[PDB]
Amino acid sequence: TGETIRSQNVMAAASIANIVKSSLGPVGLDKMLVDDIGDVTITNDGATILKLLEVEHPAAKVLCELADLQDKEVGDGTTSVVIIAAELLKNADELVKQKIHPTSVISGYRLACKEAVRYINENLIVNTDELGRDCLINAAKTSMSSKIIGINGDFFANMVVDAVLAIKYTDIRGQPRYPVNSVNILKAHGRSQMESMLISGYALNCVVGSQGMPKRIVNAKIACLDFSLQKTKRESDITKERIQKILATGANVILTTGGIDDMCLKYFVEAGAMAVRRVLKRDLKRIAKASGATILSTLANFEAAMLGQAEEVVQERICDDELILIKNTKARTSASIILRGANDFMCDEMERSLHDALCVVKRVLESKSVVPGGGAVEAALSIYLENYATSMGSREQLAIAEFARSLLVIPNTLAVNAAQDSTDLVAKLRAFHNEAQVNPERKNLKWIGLDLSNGKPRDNKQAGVFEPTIVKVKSLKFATEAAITILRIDDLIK
């Protein structure tokens, strides 16, 4: 029947957590989400589950609202914040069952969070410096592991780390902001993936734009167009007049996206232009922004010094074709990655691995403050806060202790979802982090993550699993806020 609306709220939060509990981690099980119309949805990430779960309890409403606003704040962490909040609510309910007033519990939780963010800020990792590459390459390999391309994963990691760090695009106020769309895929037929090499520029596999293109160009101007140069019955017949007019302004390499022209062979020698059809919109937009250019449809009237610059266009046998290597642009955006093999059909999994490795590497490089993943932070915080609570001495000892104990739910669920003996894994992690405090010389034993592959404790900074500091800190803040808000709503009788 029930006895306390506090209990009803905590059970509602626990049920909401249990709905999304099993999906935490990269190997989380899927969930079926069916509505009244009979439609079905398949999902793995908890954010999608919560964003469309049909909730019914006001406490569940509050918890989902906090999760959604946390998602809008930073993104990843909704499932983790919900699970942590539910664990805090359960433990606080157990405490208040022992005649501890919830206000002392709330103050203890606030103190525990305030101390936890301080502990994290003093025991995080900033190894993503210019001297930190072994960690980055190991992260790329680990994200590229558990696949048939693992043997070739070392070369791919080496070729991708320097590719992303060399193309680092600076921003307006001075931060390294690598654009993910700067890196482009480029399929290849013939030789397998075990011979891939980085290309510093884009080269569409298509018809040859021109044959008079020199290997290196001292001065080029990207005169991008969209129309096809053809004769009809500033010029009515768009073949000569506007081309020469733009060439007078300085247009050296005209980027003709449209169809080819029947007398442009002379123009491709006297001026050095190009003609390639069906250029990808994203690729052309990036190559224009790689040189500070914008797409021009017509030439009726910007043409003086706004057109982008090309420094070197290699015209040789690349990918068994006469590719156009428009590289060495102005901005750090022009690049392309060879995708060897036979086609894009049998290499779909490896190219998707390339994308996810790119995503994890760009996550690591951004937000230079990073923390190890795999639940290391949770165990370290639990060990810290157990000592902190005893050092306190007030009536918030139990509150802070239960906050410390509740954080272990994240590695616990990570271990369960990894099909391992969860208690043993969390105990091993906790024991490794114990020596990080009792032993003053074993300082560099703090980032022992959870290796989900073999299900054994593992040094994780070396492994390369990483999480932005802001994500963990702000998720902890929101978990504490949600737990506090639900725990305050208690004095009801029904």
Partner: protein, 384 residues
């Protein structure tokens, strides 16, 4: 719940698999359909069994949907797919009760699938391509045990000529094939021997009054979605069409006699009340282009298509023959008979053999049926 939901899902899978588990093979047993009015249906096909029956569990609905998607993609084998899925999900019960995680079961299943793929590709017997001998052997093997045994002599050569009418040469050697672009012409009447083949698109629509230059020795088709009106006071579109000088321009609106004269002034033949499933195949077989924006209008607005046009009113009905098309990828196949109750089935089995042929172009391989392949791969796994 935990594993309770897994057990429920696979129990629904099992209870839907054994419904049609009995209706495969050359001696399939019949099934009873009892609608809530009193009617009763004889049925041998498990596909219709699943289609007519109603289910409430999402797992069953998903499996039925996957069986369908396999049906309209590759053709046959839906009953086998359902049976196999039910069997694997049923034998997973033993391990799911071992308190051992579904993830390791999943990994084991994936390894087993990879090994089965390898051992099938190892055990498959090769077959020749473009050779009628083992093509007819496959006709005897699979295209038989259907309603075609009386009309196999015609189905066989219809398919064998039809194998070379839908090829796309995009990335390799004739490895691309599209399914609906074959110009099917199913018309009852006359003898079944009148069914034949033709290289070109066969359009059942025609101009109301063909008193104009309909056929030209080099149809340069231009597609247009605009509607032809009386005149400008629209002849302006016709005047712009005159700029590139085509001979045939395909529209999708009616044409009047005065509109007919205005069109033949430009010497262009339009069509009306045609279907999109006809317009797309016309464009595919002719390689034409559709454009009406004046700025985009260039010399590319006209694309040469066929090389010979003809109109024949076979049995006082308006046919249109477009032979010798530029792209032999959407070409005419003719069907004749009395009733469409079997010719549809014979047709569908023939394009099943068509898919057989294109895969033979990819992997000219055959696997021994009658449970031979199943036990062979089971032995391969067990010894592995």
């Amino acid at each position: 719940s935990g594993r309770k939901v897994q057990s429920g899902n696979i129990n629904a899978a099992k209870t839907i698999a054994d419904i049609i588990r009995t209706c495969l093979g050359p001696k399939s047993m019949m099934k009873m359909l009892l609608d809530p009015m009193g009617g009763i249906v004889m049925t041998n096909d498990g596909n219709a069994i699943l289609r007519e029956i109603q289910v409430q569990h999402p797992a069953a609905k998903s499996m039925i949907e996957i069986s369908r998607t396999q049906d309209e993609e590759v053709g046959d084998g839906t009953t086998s797919v359902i049976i196999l899925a039910g069997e694997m999900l049923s034998v997973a019960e033993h391990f799911l009760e071992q308190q051992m995680h579904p993830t390791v079961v999943i990994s084991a299943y994936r390894k087993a699938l990879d090994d089965m793929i390898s051992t099938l590709k190892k055990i498959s017997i090769p077959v020749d391509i473009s050779d009628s001998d083992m093509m007819l052997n496959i006709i005897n093997s699979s295209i038989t045990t259907k309603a075609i045994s009386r009309w196999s002599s015609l189905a066989c050569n219809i398919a064998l000529d039809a194998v070379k009418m839908v090829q796309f040469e995009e990335n390799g050697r004739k490895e691309i094939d599209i399914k609906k672009y074959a110009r099917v012409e199913k018309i009852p009447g006359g003898i079944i021997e009148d069914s034949c083949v033709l290289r070109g698109v066969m359009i059942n629509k025609d101009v109301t009054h063909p008193r104009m230059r309909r056929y030209i020795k080099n149809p340069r088709i231009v597609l247009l979605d605009s509607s032809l009106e009386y005149k400008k006071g629209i002849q302006q579109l016709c005047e712009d069409i005159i700029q590139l000088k085509p001979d045939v321009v395909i529209t999708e609106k009616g044409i009047s006699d005065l509109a007919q004269h205005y069109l033949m002034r430009a010497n262009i033949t339009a069509i009306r009340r045609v279907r999109k499933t006809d317009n797309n195949r016309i464009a595919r077989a002719c390689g034409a282009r559709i454009v009406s924006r004046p700025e985009e209008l260039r010399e590319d607005d006209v694309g040469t298509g066929a090389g010979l046009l003809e109109i024949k009113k076979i049995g006082d009905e308006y046919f249109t023959f477009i032979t010798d098309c530029k792209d032999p990828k959407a070409c005419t196949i003719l069907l004749r008979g009395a009733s469409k109750e079997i010719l549809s089935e014979v047709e569908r089995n023939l394009q099943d053999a068509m898919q057989v042929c294109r895969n033979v172009l990819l992997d000219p391989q055959l696997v021994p049926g009658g449970g031979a392949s199943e036990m062979a791969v089971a032995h391969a796994l067990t010894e592995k």
